[PDB]
Each structure stands twice: as structure tokens, then as C-alpha cells.
Design a protein around this ligand. Structure first.
Ligand SMILES: [Cl-]
Lengths: 297, 304
């Protein structure tokens, strides 16, 4: 269906036939990106051109900027990224490390190199698009490409343009529902059940360098063995972790699932983490939480 | 290409009869090599494909109190494939060693995964223990109609060749010894990053590496290594340091690449550990530090 293809350089690219290429960094494959793909699928209709894409293993900042661990954080894991681009209609996905050499390529070297190797017959790119050490715009595209160039207008909501930067921030703020509206699907995190510490809890360790929602209590869906269960997720600092760990209370589920990988889909935030003055207060909150979670939709 | 991840046995797709080798395969060390060797000498009698099933993470995780060390491997998955593929593996299955998988009895396992696998014959280690029941190497014939082959432990002068001996050697710093047992030098996958550039300032430019995987790092020290960048190998010197801070352990991975003058920020590089030059130290002076770097560079250039 889709081939992801790790490449050291353009020489590695193997596309057989003319294609339409979509240009961008593609973290999270949000509504904005999807619009690029909707337009690309419309352009690949006349000649049945397949759609191909190249993007990067890691943020370009790693090559450009002082090192910081957060520079390794992704909205989506690689498998989820591929899954979402597959749904967009992409047929070849080339993955390249953004490097000093790649970064020094001017707009012209870039076409002479990656575009050619890709056989672009039609190029789709966003209004905000920026490329080459030359730092050219989306308009300058026409000047570098023999073939057709389509520039898609920015996708905006009441708040503004839909961007990865907004998604990171919404997640960090704990606004999972907003992140999910922007993403176009609820954020998926991949975790593993582990042996760690009323209502019983699964202890999850996040397996990817993906953003963790803010501390709080969330309504989530959890996928185990291809079956989705509703659950409450709790994230706290010095409470559920101290490495990203968090906890889940899976409703209507009792089984031993240690060492099992699960998918968490973040649906909504309920409340902040809170210290409780009494046990009774705590239980009351949990009962209320449970009700809110089982009934959310 | 070779690796397909599965939730369960239903996911397995072997088209035809095949040879299935069993064990937990970390590092694809030589004793593993013999098992494949024995299996290959059997897969010849009917020309059948070797297919193999191992786990994403230590079985220790479904079984014991959690600890991050449990997520540590000798090899990252891409390298694990290489050794296996080279070793003539055709289909690799990766499954999570869940509580549910733990509960399978030895019959039950044969009924599901072996059935799915299509094994005409099974090749196994003398040590190997499977199943909830604990049925051992010898209990295998009863379960399997087909030929059961029990390769005898591939010993070395030190003794039995194991992942525990490899894990131990790496942690001790003795990477030569680990390369020996592995049958190849340990590969570590790093990414060049904008770290501490005191090296470039001094005129002895270095690349700061962040390890990309949950794999064992060698004992702190300075090492001769080869580095692969853009498919080209270069002799290099590597410095490894692990300094505690409140927030946690800060790990420094430094590589000095001989006869290399390009900017590689962002590039993934592979580090192959050949031997250990010396202990890590602290230099009070540019003179002290430089004399020591020349002496290390001579050792590194001259190493084989
Ligand atoms: Cl990681």
C-alpha cells in the first residue's frame, strides 16, 4: 500500500514513474497537511501519477541549533506518521536525516537533486513553504520547476493557522481535544504495561519520543489486542512518573496484560492533578471522574 | 523486509513448511550462529525457509518489577535483523512477551505459534526452556512429530558463549571481547548534535553523539572505534562519559574522526567498538590534554 524508504541521499530514491510530490515537514499530519494531500490527489487524477513524499527522521533544529533533548520529541511515532500519510494517499515515503549537507543545498541544488530523483511532474506545497539555504518562498517555486506547481492556501480556524507548533503547545497545555481537532484524529501514544505500584491501575511506560500531555486526568480510549476500551488516564509529576510514565484505569476490563503494548488515544481533559484533604473527598472525585469518562462522547 | 510484527499467531503468514529456530536472540552471538548453522545444514534436506520468532522487549518486563534497565538491548532492531538475515533468516516475527503469552503451556504454544509457523523441523539450544510448563530441550520430541535438533552449547575457552557474557563485557569496557563473542564489533547508532565544542575550539574537532536507541553503552573511557558516515568507514577515537546530576545521568558520547573535515550535524553515524585505549580523566591544561590526545591518536591510527 505504502512503502516507507530510508534514504542516505537522493541516489537512494527509486521512484519508477512520474509522480506528484508534496513538499513540507510533516509532523503529525494535521488538517493543514491533509489539505495538501487532498489537492495532490486531485492533481494525480489526470495521469494516475502516484504521490511521493520525503521528510525527516528528526527535527531540522538538531542540525541548526544548540542541542536540547526536547529537539527529539515528535508529535506522532514513525508508524503512526506512516499510517496517517498512507491514509492521505501517499505511495512512497522517503525518510532522510536533515543534515548539514542537506541544509546547505540551495533552492536550485534541491531541485537538481531530490526533485529530479523523485520524478516530480507536479509539485504541491503550502503557502508558508520555505526551502534552500537560499531561503526561497513558495512563489519562487515556479522559477525552479518545469512542471506544474500548486500552492495551497493556509488552513485556519477561529484561533488561527493550524500548525505543528500549535499542536505541541496544546498537548503541553493539556488540551488534548484541541490537539485532536487540529490533528484530525485523537493523538495516539504507544505504551507498555509494566509492573509498578478502590480502583485498580495499569502502569504504562511511553515507548516513543513523543509529546506527553500535561499533568491531569483525561478521558482516553485504550487499544489492547485490537480492542478499544474506555479509560481514565492520570498524568502527574512525582506521582505517575519521575522517563514518561502514566497510569490508566481501564473500564470493563480485567486481564493480566503486563508486557503488552497498548495504544492510548487522548480524547479529553477532566481536571488537574489535585491533592485531596480526605479519603472521602478522593473517592467522591474518582466516582465523579468515572462517570464522566464512561459517558463522554 | 525480514521483520513482521504480530499481536498474535493469527498474524503469522508462512506460506509453506519451514525451519524454525528457537531461543531469545539478543546480539545474534556465535552460539546463536551455530544454531543457525545447524539449522542451515538441516534446511538443506528439503530446501525450507528459516523463520524465527523473538520478542520486542525483555520477557523480564512482563515478569518482574519494572526498571528502565529492562528496556536495554545489545543491538537495536535494525542491526538485529542484519545479523539474523545474514544468518539466513527469511521471516522474522516480533511479538510482545505479554502476560498472556507467558501463560501458554508447551502444548498450547505448539498448537498456536508452531502450527502457524509450519515447522517441519525445530532447531534448539541445549539450554532452551519454553512454555508455562517449563518443558525443556528434551521434552520437544513429544510435542513435535518432526525432527528435533538440539545443538550442543557453543563453548569457548572462557566457557559457554552468552548474552550475559556480552552484556557484562560491554559494561566492563572490554569491547574487544564482546566483538569476539558477537562475531562482529558492537555497532552503536548515534546522531551528531550541537553539543560541547571545546574540541573544535582547541583545533581538535569532535562530533557530539546522542545515542538513538535503548542499547548498552561501554564503560566510561576512551576507545578505538570505526565510524560509518554516509556508508564510508573512518578510524576514530571515542570518549564515553556518564555524569550524574539531580535530574539524572548525563551521558557524553564523543567521537574524534581521523582525516575527516565535513560538517555532519544531523547525520546518523554508526560506531563500531574495536578496543579500549584508556580511562577517562580530567585535564588541567591544554598542554596535558593535547599530549594525551596525540598519544591516543597514535594508538588509534596504529591499532589492528
Ligand atoms: Cl527512546
Amino acid at each position: 500500500m505504502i512503502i516507507t524508504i530510508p534514504i542516505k541521499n537522493q541516489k537512494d530514491i527509486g521512484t519508477p514513474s512520474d509522480s506528484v510530490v508534496v513538499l513540507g515537514y510533516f509532523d503529525g499530519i494535521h488538517k493543514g497537511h491533509q489539505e495538501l494531500f487532498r489537492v495532490a490527489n486531485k492533481a494525480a487524477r489526470k495521469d494516475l501519477l502516484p504521490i511521493v513524499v520525503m521528510t525527516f527522521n528528526e527535527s531540522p533544529k538538531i542540525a541548526l541549533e544548540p542541542y536540547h533533548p526536547d529537539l527529539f520529541l515528535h508529535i506522532l511515532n514513525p508508524a503512526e506518521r506512516e499510517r496517517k500519510l498512507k491514509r492521505e494517499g501517499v505511495e512512497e515515503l522517503y525518510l532522510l536525516d536533515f543534515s548539514s549537507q542537506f541544509a546547505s543545498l540551495t533552492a536550485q541544488e534541491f531541485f537538481a537533486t531530490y526533485i529530479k530523483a523523485m520524478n516530480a511532474k507536479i509539485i504541491v506545497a503550502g503557502f508558508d513553504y520555505t526551502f534552500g539555504s537560499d531561503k526561497k518562498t513558495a512563489e519562487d517555486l515556479k522559477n525552479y520547476f518545469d512542471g506544474e506547481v500548486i500552492i495551497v492556501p493556509p488552513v485556519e480556524d477561529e484561533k488561527g493557522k493550524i500548525s505543528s507548533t500549535r499542536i505541541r503547545q496544546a498537548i503541553l497545555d493539556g488540551n488534548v481535544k484541541e490537539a485532536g481537532k487540529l490533528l484530525g484524529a485523537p493523538l495516539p501514544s504507544r505504551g507498555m504495561v509494566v509492573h509498578g505500584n478502590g480502583y485498580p491501575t495499569a502502569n504504562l511506560v511511553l515507548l516513543d519520543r513523543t509529546y506527553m500531555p500535561a499533568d491531569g486526568v483525561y478521558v482516553v480510549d485504550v487499544e489492547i489486542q485490537r480492542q478499544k476500551y474506555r479509560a481514565m488516564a492520570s498524568v502527574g509529576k512525582n506521582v505517575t512518573f519521575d522517563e514518561a510514565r502514566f497510569e490508566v484505569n481501564i473500564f470493563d476490563f480485567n486481564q493480566d496484560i503486563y508486557g503488552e503494548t497498548v495504544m492510548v488515544y487522548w480524547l479529553d481533559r477532566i481536571r488537574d492533578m489535585t491533592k485531596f484533604d480526605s479519603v472521602d473527598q478522593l473517592v467522591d472525585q474518582l466516582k465523579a471522574d468515572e462517570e464522566v469518562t464512561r459517558n463522554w462522547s
